[PDB]
Nucleic acid binder design. Sequence first.
DNA 1: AAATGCCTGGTCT
RNA 2: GACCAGGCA
Lengths: 196, 133, 141, 43, 84, 65, 114, 559, 159, 263, 158
Amino acid sequence: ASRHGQKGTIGITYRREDMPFTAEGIVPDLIINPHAIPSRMTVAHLIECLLSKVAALSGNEGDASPFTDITVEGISKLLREHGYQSRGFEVMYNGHTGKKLMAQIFFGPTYYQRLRHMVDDKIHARARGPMQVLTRQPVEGRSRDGGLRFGEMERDCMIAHGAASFLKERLMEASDAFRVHICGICGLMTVIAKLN
Amino acid sequence: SNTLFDDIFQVSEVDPGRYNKVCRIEAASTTQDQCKLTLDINVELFPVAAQDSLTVTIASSLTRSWRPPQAGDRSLADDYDYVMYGTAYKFEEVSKDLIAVYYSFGGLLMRLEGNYRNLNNLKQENAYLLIRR
Amino acid sequence: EGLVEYIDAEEEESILIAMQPEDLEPAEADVDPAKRIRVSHHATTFTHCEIHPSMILGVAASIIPFPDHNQSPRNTYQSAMGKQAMGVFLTNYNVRMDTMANILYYPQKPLGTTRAMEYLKFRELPAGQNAIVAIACYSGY
Amino acid sequence: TLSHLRRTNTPIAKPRQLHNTHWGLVCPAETPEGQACGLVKNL
Amino acid sequence: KAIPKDQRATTPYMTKYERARILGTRALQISMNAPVFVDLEGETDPLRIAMKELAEKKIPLVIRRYLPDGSFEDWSVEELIVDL
Amino acid sequence: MIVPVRCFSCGKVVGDKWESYLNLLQEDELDEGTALSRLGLKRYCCRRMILTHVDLIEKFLRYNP
Amino acid sequence: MNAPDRFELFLLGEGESKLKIDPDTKAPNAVVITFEKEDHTLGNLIRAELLNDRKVLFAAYKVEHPFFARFKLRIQTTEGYDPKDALKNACNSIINKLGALKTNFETEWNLQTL
Amino acid sequence: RGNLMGKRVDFSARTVISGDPNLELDQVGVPKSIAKTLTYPEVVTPYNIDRLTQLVRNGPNEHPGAKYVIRDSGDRIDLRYSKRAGDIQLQYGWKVERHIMDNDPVLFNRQPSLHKMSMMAHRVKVIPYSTFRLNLSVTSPYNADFDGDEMNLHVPQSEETRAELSQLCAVPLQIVSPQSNKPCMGIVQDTLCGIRKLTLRDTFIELDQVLNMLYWVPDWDGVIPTPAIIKPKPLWSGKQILSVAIPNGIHLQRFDEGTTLLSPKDNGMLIIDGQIIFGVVEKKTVGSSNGGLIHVVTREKGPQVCAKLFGNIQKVVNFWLLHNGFSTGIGDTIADGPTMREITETIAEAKKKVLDVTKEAQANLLTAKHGMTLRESFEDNVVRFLNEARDKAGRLAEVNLKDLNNVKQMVMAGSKGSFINIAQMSACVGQQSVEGKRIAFGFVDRTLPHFSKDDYSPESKGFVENSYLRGLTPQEFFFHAMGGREGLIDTAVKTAETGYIQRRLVKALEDIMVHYDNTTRNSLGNVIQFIYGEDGMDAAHIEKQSLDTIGGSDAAFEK
Amino acid sequence: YDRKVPSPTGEYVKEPEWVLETDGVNLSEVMTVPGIDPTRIYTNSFIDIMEVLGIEAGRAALYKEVYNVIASDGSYVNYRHMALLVDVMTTQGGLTSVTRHGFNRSNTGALMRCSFEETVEILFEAGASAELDDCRGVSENVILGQMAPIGTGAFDVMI
Amino acid sequence: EEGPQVKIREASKDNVDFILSNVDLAMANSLRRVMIAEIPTLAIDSVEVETNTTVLADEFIAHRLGLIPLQSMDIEQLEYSRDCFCEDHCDKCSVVLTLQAFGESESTTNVYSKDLVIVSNLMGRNIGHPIIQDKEGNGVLICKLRKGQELKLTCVAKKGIAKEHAKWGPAAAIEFEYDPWNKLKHTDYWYEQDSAKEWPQSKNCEYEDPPNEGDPFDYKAQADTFYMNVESVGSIPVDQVVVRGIDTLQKKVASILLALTQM
Amino acid sequence: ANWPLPVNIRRIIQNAQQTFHIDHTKPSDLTIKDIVLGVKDLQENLLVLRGKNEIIQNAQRDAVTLFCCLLRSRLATRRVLQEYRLTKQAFDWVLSNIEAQFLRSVVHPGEMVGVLAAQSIGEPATQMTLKKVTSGVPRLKEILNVAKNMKTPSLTVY
DNA sequence: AAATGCCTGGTCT
RNA sequence: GACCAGGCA
Ligand SMILES: [Mg+2]
Ligand SMILES: [Zn+2]
Ligand SMILES: [Zn+2]
Ligand SMILES: [Zn+2]
């Protein structure tokens, strides 16, 4: 995630070549979709880039302190003196093709955090393992190789899909499943089973 | 193997409404005051301007996958400069002793107004637009 | 030497506080169009002046660059995530035996700092890297 | 760690609202989402 | 409480749910090495087969439509129209 | 934790320029900016690599055993 | 843990041949050649050359999924012209130009001082 | 609640999800490992033994393999341990718990599941790496996004069970949802933002690409369509090729504000014989709207054909965009120099109005409207005054934005953004508010200790004049923060309270269904509706039509 | 207020009209007031509309209401849906809440009520007065792990 | 000569700014990529750790070793271990270096790549030599030790390519521009007023003629002439990256030709 | 005049407009009897119920009234002839078409509307989060609970 | 009498 | 069992 409340998981990695590139030959370490910006109004993010760019260039620590007189202009003014378009855009060429990209792109350095919680630490996936002794129902947690909760809410959906059979198969054949003997007179599980 | 409409037009206005490679042209017809024209033209490939003498042609000839060169030494309804292909959609009664039509060249549009075209103008997809000088 | 005082919310009720000292105690005798707009120092009453507004913040939010160019709630989110970030939580992580520890291989101090990170020792034990990012529609992935 | 050591909890009319008087004392932003939002504060 | 083949008011058309259960149940029989009343143009998946046993009205199954009182109406997959 | 061998971004070996960089700062009394350029680090992908590094190892070495 | 070995990007595994040639079914004199453990570098280069031949009516290519390193080149040529030939030629014309560039560069590189 | 109606079931799997543009709408990407765990009891049959035996030989740790072999007696031959695991001659009648393979039907859901759409059947597609991979246009029904959401997968165990998923709960079958009686899956983000550009009249494509785009569409009839242009250069338009995605027989008329079978603004929409004639393609056309190219294509060509429509449109548009590129930066939030001037003063007068009201009010000259305190009326005015101010400075900003401005550029597609976003990012942010009122006097008669007692001026009570661009001032900050909080809080509330309602409704109606006499009764049999929805018509098979006999002058009804 | 109205010439026009909105309710006495059009007087207090105009009207408002909640949010929902609700809320001749005080008392088998807020109790007052559950509720067949009268389990299949 | 033709401007041990003209953009690129990703090289691809009393982790150190650039000119006569008929490795498919460092002084001993010590028999081929461009001659700073810290390693450098791993890239960074003035109109610049006053002007413009005001749009022109520059890590002399690049690409092509044949 | 009804007639028409290539230049072969009597007859084969008795035969009429209105206003003599030059063939097709579609738009016994509805209201409800009345969640809550202490009562008189 | 769903993890009796 | 911390919403 950036430092502006914008988290995201990786969706694929591209090797240097397949990546879009700068005429200078610089290529991005990360690419985020423009669409995660208009609505979140997280402008500072954009700014920070403008700043961090200029900074890295001129080897100056970029001062993004809150209430200061630091302007997006004063910065854009500095970045131009550095031979770059005053906003962060930079013509870029499509890695596959080498051709130019019809749309210049916001390119610069931005401080990004590596959050904990990594797929591999979550990928649980069970196919009938150990069950609770008390309910004869699958156990909780993945550290124990348990089952996923097909709670109330999921059921309603199945009911809504009119998929009667599936439901039975979910709430029975998988998890609780037990055979009991009953008295054909007092429907109680009071019938001594002597199978032999 | 035909031709369906010929006519020189005088361009009165050229409008580039927030497009840099397209302008919507409106040129009147020399000869029959009844005929007027509204067209979308790629001003990047075929400039135009204030009062030009444009020659227009329609037809439906010179639908199988498109091919390109070779015939560069074959057929050639290239007696013009600018040319388009399209599909016509609606024929309308401008009412009175006049009638109009609408063609779409992959989005580039054209409306033609007159009357004797009831015959000379097709009624189907086919429809090339040829312009010269 | 009485140049400062400790005020609690109760006494705060009875005082007038100027934000910036400068910008709030010169006499009004052209303005940069890119700077935000501030009202005026209307008060012949000031008894105190803020050490520095950026101080109204605390640890977490302190590490946000320009959180004053950011939509309110997004600042709160970031503050909750800065605590899930990786980095060197202590130079002696190697000598401490504790349930899970996550350390960054090559921590980088941010190109974008806050005059309040100097005290939060951020630059010394950074949590995050300075990646070259591109906001662009690429493979659609 | 710094943030944990500078934390505040409030058990149990409107208490999770950021409040005027809080200015200067508690961080206006830092606070957990949902559950104990506004109840857990940070100096 | 039964209802003669006449005075039948239920939908002539087969409900999706009915066909999905019919499809399932035949697909299941087919998966259990049961005779196939159709000629496979080269099909192997039980369901895919069973689908084709229906497309050629050759599925010996009948649906019993219980009304809300207790009565019902027996319709045969041969009768029922499969538009959907 | 030690100067990254090579730049994440472009791959320009960089780990063989830390000490050089430091000297350029302390003795040559230069500003981080030029010091960089003199070391041949002209693009920002390769400038943040050194400029931002926080040589933590120097603090891990003070731990006796 | 679900990551595939890097070498699967350029090393054919078992039952994988560099090329597969199936006859397209939609058009005539059309062929879809699938390439294995090859990406854009080749695909696009050959697509571009294949479009210099005036007896070539069509030629496109696609890496259907980044995960995997393989692609498809489609070719349609003038009656009597076998695309496989249209392919052969292209690869050659390509190699030739390449050799050329190799030389001319090596030439210039030698007139250089430093 | 947690053991009888809600149990922990076997054959379930869960991980992080991420979008995959080269996966079909109705599929789902299952990471190899998970597939190697989840299994499916298939009985041995002459129509399969070869494949089955072959898999049993592949064993439990190579994908197309299996685990366990079940026999007549009911014994379980564990394929990973078993002197005889490299032996085993399959016998008709036996069961081979096999790995989950490609094309299996599986129930995929995201929680909370407050829909049918929250649980849908997808065709399996085993792939590398470890995240469920899903088509983007399957995003909204599950209400997912890829910032970290995890999703649950369940595998049918019975031949029937499968059928029940593939015939009733399949993603295709769910495109047109009965709740909103419109479709519930559109085209988003890149594909949407792009499709628009790709459509602009100004947008033309040439040979090399065209040929790729065409090929890119899998169902291509390989027949290169004739260029819109054949003159100096044979160029195709965007519409031209996109139309390849649209199948034949699809028709669609639109007409937005200024449309006119010549739509000078490339407005409305006109699609005939699956060929786009006029109009830029954006949300209204391809969104998940009522009239939509999707609502029409589902109803006309079939769920599946329409299922495909998605990938196609995507594959083409995505590719096109992959090569056109698109982005955004601060620059996109900067307004014309003279504009900020006109804006800053636009506010300058709003403040004077508030001030002029204020003095009026303090003179007791004000006339209190009926039912309101002269005090109430006062407040309401200022609030109105300030809102308008914001909205006009905002509008003022929206006009600068050149068609090339990426933000505006997304707003036009309808791919993210709205007036408000622009207005706040570019011009004045706005009047903060807590409990429907402008910031209160937490302190005695004042907002903060930086103001004098009794001060109802805008700055004092929460009016953030600046923009997110220019930056807020401490006070502004703090204020905007207060509102910020009010938001986050009722956010946490509006969730639980609703979650509860969602249930009471579900329990209350739970057992109500349309019986075989077209009636609608609950378990008891007690009739609730003599005809469902009063027309015994299914919600999905409905659409907003115009009753041409109600309106128009009496003369026109006659003419 | 704005009200479209058929004009003598046929077209619907906009004939604005004065309307009084109130901050307090007492329907029973206001209709009777002269000058007002008692045909249209309305209130968002369906209960009151119930007690005064009958239940069939109450159902109406009950919907008119719910609807407004959902549409004020720009959102739409097909009639039938809300219809069903309101009706289910309106068949027992009175206004039955979606709360436990309403539909769990309903006349239903014990088990359904079991799955909602007053299990324990519901099962006792159910045991005490020997209740016989038909076992035709979906919620109960779920408890017994059997198919239910759902799409797949409404019709029976036979040879 | 024939088509494709170059025009070196700059040149040194590391860079080679040059003009590549009369070629297809498709090629300019294919070339560019290949340079970046398929030219072979020698690099440590296996570290056997004997002792590590250091402050750094084993694999952390191992990672860096892999990244350390090694000589690779004669890599064309060193095999891929996966093709050598040896069990594991040998002197026909690898190069083994030893690293031994002991914290001797109480003044922090640094460990450079210049300390790797080729143990295997190079067999008289220029291969696997800690590349050093330092001024002081201490290629890369691998690690630092304290009072009495030990580090005893044994690495096995193998032939590889940027594709299996980036450590195997010889290229570093490649500049690449074409049509400095947007005559080709392959882009539509983003502006606030004058896209010409806001967007910089590339050095490459100087090497080309302007657009001539009223001239129409050149709708038939394609991309000729490209202004590149190859930076070089150094395991390979810059000239080579360009050649070997051209070579490799050329071989890749040939193998498809050879393919049809065996088909 | 815009109300959700099964069978988008407008479409069927357009889907005849070009399936039979209908030229707006020559006259149709439609008999005024054809159209008028045809449209009428169509209205007999829509059905939603099939009991042969009075009561049910009257329900069936009710449940179709509206749609039919749509149907009649659309398939009117002028219209058919002047608005969209159909032909005995096209027209005749359009009819057979509507029927089928209609029959396809009927609900299927089994459809679990109870839940289907509950959710259709609960969902768009969990999308609500914010001219002085009680709306949103609170109000919806007010309603469902059948509260008597509503905060924003009001009476609207005309 | 009731007060979202689900999911992972960590400490102490 | 007690309990708090976190992810999505
Ligand atoms: Mg989320
Ligand atoms: Zn008994
Ligand atoms: Zn670099
Ligand atoms: Zn060897």
